[PDB]
Amino acid sequence: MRIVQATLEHLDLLAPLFVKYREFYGMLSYPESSRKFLEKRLRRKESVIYLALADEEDRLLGFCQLYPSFSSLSLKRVWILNDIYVAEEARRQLVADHLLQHAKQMARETHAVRMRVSTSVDNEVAQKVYESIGFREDQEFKNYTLPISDELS
């Protein structure tokens, strides 16, 4: 019902929900590393995290995270959309939407050339939601990956 930008203040409110998200997608919960990760991001202002809060109290219904980027070619901003997530109790779609919309309106407001998202080939649902809000899988480019570290720890 209400969207707000996460700041260091919300860390404790968002930390537990951030875990649920990672767990829901196949990761080990690492409660502390997860809270530590979010701190660096909130504290260093390296990402924009939107929080969907119920009108009454400050209970996190869902959250969204984007990473700021750029296009050297068109000398304009780009927004990487890494995370989007709603809690069980909350209705996925209703909340996922307000977040994504607020997020997209922000990209527009900041004259971004585009928004780019990347997700597991095994996330049919996740991918469906993305497609329903614009995103396309432009097949006119080849995507590469070079594993450097571990994904598990």
Add this chain to the structure above:
Amino acid sequence: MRIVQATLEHLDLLAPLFVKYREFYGMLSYPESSRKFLEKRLRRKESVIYLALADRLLGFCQLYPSFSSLSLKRVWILNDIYVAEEARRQLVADHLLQHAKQMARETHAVRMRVSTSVNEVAQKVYESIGFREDQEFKNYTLPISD
């Protein structure tokens, strides 16, 4: 023969080669804006530009910062790499990308990413050092502006 992270002291030297890189990809060379763009990226540490010095600028490469929430780690996105016309085509590139790859290791990134037109020469250069066709993820774009 020498790779170094670009600093604000290199702006004058890097700006023009950066413009030639954009022009190469069919863009309107914005001499100032491109220079303006680099200065801010450099001053705000919103990217990492590695210079290949011989000392005249032989080529450069730039990566933008990203993260993997899932594995709680950094992800480096190799966005630009350009070797000046008057230089071998794959030597300065290897030294640049290798040095980049090494930074990825020293900063514990989960992975490095790179894209390109479906541009055979590039692919041979990237595959030349680890980059494999991403079979773990599915990638999307969504046009936003002009």
